[PDB]
Amino acid sequence: PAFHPGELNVYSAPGDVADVSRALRLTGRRVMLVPTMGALHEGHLALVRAAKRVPGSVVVVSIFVNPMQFAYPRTPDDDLAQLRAEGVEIAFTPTTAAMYPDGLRTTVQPGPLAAELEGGPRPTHFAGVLTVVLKLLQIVRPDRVFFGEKDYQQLVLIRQLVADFNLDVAVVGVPTVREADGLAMSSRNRYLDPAQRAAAVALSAALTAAAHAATAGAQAALDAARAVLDAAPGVAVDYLELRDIGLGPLNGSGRLLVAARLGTTRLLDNIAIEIGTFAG
Amino acid sequence: MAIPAFHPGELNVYSAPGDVADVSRALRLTGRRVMLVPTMGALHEGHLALVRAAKRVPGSVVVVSIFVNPTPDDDLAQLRAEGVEIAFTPTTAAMYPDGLRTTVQPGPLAAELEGGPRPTHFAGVLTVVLKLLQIVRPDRVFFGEKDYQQLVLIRQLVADFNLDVAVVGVPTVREADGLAMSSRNRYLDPAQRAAAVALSAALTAAAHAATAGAQAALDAARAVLDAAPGVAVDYLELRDIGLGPMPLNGSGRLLVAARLGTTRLLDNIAIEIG
Numbered sequence: 001p002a003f004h005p006g007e008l009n010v011y012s013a014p015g016d017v018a019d020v021s022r023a024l025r026l027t028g029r030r031v032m033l034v035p036t037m038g039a040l041h042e043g044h045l046a047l048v049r050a051a052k053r054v055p056g057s058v059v060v061v062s063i064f065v066n067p068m069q070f071a072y073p074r075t076p077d078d079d080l081a082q083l084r085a086e087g088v089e090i091a092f093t094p095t096t097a098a099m100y101p102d103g104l105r106t107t108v109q110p111g112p113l114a115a116e117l118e119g120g121p122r123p124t125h126f127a128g129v130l131t132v133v134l135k136l137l138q139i140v141r142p143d144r145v146f147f148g149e150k151d152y153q154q155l156v157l158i159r160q161l162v163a164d165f166n167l168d169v170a171v172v173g174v175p176t177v178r179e180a181d182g183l184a185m186s187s188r189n190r191y192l193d194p195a196q197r198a199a200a201v202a203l204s205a206a207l208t209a210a211a212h213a214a215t216a217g218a219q220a221a222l223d224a225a226r227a228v229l230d231a232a233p234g235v236a237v238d239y240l241e242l243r244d245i246g247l248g249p250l251n252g253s254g255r256l257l258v259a260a261r262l263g264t265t266r267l268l269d270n271i272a273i274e275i276g277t278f279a280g
Numbered sequence: 281m282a283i284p285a286f287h288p289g290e291l292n293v294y295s296a297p298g299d300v301a302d303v304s305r306a307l308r309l310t311g312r313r314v315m316l317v318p319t320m321g322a323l324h325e326g327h328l329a330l331v332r333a334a335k336r337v338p339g340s341v342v343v344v345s346i347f348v349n350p351t352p353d354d355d356l357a358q359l360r361a362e363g364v365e366i367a368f369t370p371t372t373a374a375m376y377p378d379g380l381r382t383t384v385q386p387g388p389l390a391a392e393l394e395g396g397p398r399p400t401h402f403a404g405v406l407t408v409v410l411k412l413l414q415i416v417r418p419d420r421v422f423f424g425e426k427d428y429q430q431l432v433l434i435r436q437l438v439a440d441f442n443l444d445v446a447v448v449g450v451p452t453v454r455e456a457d458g459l460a461m462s463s464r465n466r467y468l469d470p471a472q473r474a475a476a477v478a479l480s481a482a483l484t485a486a487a488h489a490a491t492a493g494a495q496a497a498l499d500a501a502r503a504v505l506d507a508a509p510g511v512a513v514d515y516l517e518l519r520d521i522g523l524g525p526m527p528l529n530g531s532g533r534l535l536v537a538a539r540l541g542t543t544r545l546l547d548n549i550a551i552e553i554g
């Protein structure tokens with residue numbers, strides 16, 4: 001397949017991008033993978049910009065959504081335009097047929113973390129995610145793969161996949177990008193009406209209140225977050241949990257995670273927490 | 281940073297996964313084609329046929345792994361005598377530093393045949409296979425047709441996860457009377473060992489009877505097994521070559537498994553229907 005450098009090259013066949021990627025790597029380029037669902041916003045552009053900054057980098061951005069056999073925003077044209085503007089040179093847009101010619105046959109079984117937090121009500125969700133991440137990693141064989149911290153549990157599970165199957169790829173976690181008031185950027189934010197968008201600031205306010213409260217201990221940090229969420233009218237909290245950084249249920253460093261509903265829209269956010277001395 | 285020592289033409293033994301990964305990557309960059317032969321040690325002629333097949337690829341460097349899932353000396357001597365340059369002998373803790381956590385979940389073929397008595401057996405196997413492919417990154421990986429259902433499941437793994445390796449199935453090596461080679465054979469007493477030739481005799485008989493149709497093939501195999509004492513047959517099935525249902529004709533595979541005393545024996549053969 002053709003590859004025009006300094007232009008955006010779009011491939012849909014896995015064999016096409018795998019051949020292009022291999023050829024580029026043989027000629028010294030380091031292949032960077034940014035896996036996405038499409039509906040790209042500035043939080044995805046932060047991953048692209050981190051990938052671009054690796055010297056010698058060729059950036060592959062994949063766009064794929066799992067089929068739902070038994071609502072997700074799909075803006076393809078528009079995604080590719082953003083990529084061109086970022087000077088990405090390869091978009092990989094495989095069909096469902098090319099990814100699952102045999103339906104779901106061999107799959108990845110995550111460890112016990114997948115049954116907690118986001119997985120509690122959807123016990124098979126992360127098996128779906130990690131199966132596609134492993135396939136994309138085998139098709140593209142990147143040097144580095146980039147994920148947002150906004151989906152923190154997904155990130156931890158991806159690092160478990162990479163460690164547990166001895167994958168030769170470095171996983172790069174990229175900090176969440178936020179709107180001016182603190183709201184974490186998400187494709188789902190478009191589903192908030194104006195009142196809901198106003199109320200949704202409480203997630204990030206609660207988290208950053210807790211991160212500063214934490215000089216007083218874990219309980220004070222948790223109670224500060226809960227109070228702020230309790231003060232927010234249309235916010236229905238699904239969970240608010242403080243865990244160790246690898247999402248084991250805690251020492252001096254932790255991660256605080258929240259999930260909440262605003263009407264039908266489910267929002268997540270999370271923050272680094274340092275208990276006692278030092279931080280803040 | 282710095283590649284481990286590798287001495288061409290000798291047996292280089294590595295136990296650290298990062299060590300064999302680095303030496304494999306460095307040899308591949310110099311032109312060599314990395315061939316991987318995964319084993320559980322206790323090597324016999326069945327394993328050396330995999331080694332010989334890997335050796336004959338031009339430019340090959342042969343990696344033999346030895347690992348058992350939760351004499352090392354004698355195995356290593358056999359590999360040395362075969363001209364193998366790389367043995368990979370990881371510990372359990374090297375392979376599972378975080379315990380059993382992420383794993384491969386096979387498709388439904390894994391619950392059939394060997395998966396009857398051992399329903400998690402293949403998930404264990406495919407997990408280790410996938411790790412060894414990622415550590416070693418071979419151009420081709422060699423498995424015996426003796427474990428046919430495993431071989432089929434590995435081809436499903438490689439297709440389903442878009443693995444860039446070629447899977448090579450190598451024909452079963454047999455003792456002079458046809459018994460397929462296995463470290464289990466030495467447990468058989470003389471009565472059991474004489475009866476065990478019924479598995480291969482049944483399969484070959486079926487493969488020749490198959491000009492008369494699928495049912496002739498199966499009835500010929502079941503006659504030969506019925507003539508043996510102390511051979512408790514667990515299954516005898518004719519399937520297509522991918523272990524789906526046997527088509528009306530074309531290529532298939534006949535598989536058998538039996539218990540003689542406490543020893544489970546397996547065999548299988550290509551069948552062409554009519």
Ligand SMILES: CN(C)S(=O)(=O)c1ccsc1
Nearest residue numbers: 066067068069070096097
């Ligand atoms: C009904 N699903 C969306 S599906 O993946 O089984 C599908 C896709 C094209 S037809 C059915």
Ligand SMILES: CN(C)S(=O)(=O)c1ccsc1
Nearest residue numbers: 035036064065066132133
């Ligand atoms: C983790 N993702 C953004 S991915 O591109 O591996 C994916 C997972 C389910 S659809 C796309």
Ligand SMILES: CN(C)S(=O)(=O)c1ccsc1
Nearest residue numbers: 318319347349405408409
């Ligand atoms: C299929 N084997 C011979 S392997 O080396 O991948 C393995 C599987 C469980 S222990 C060794």
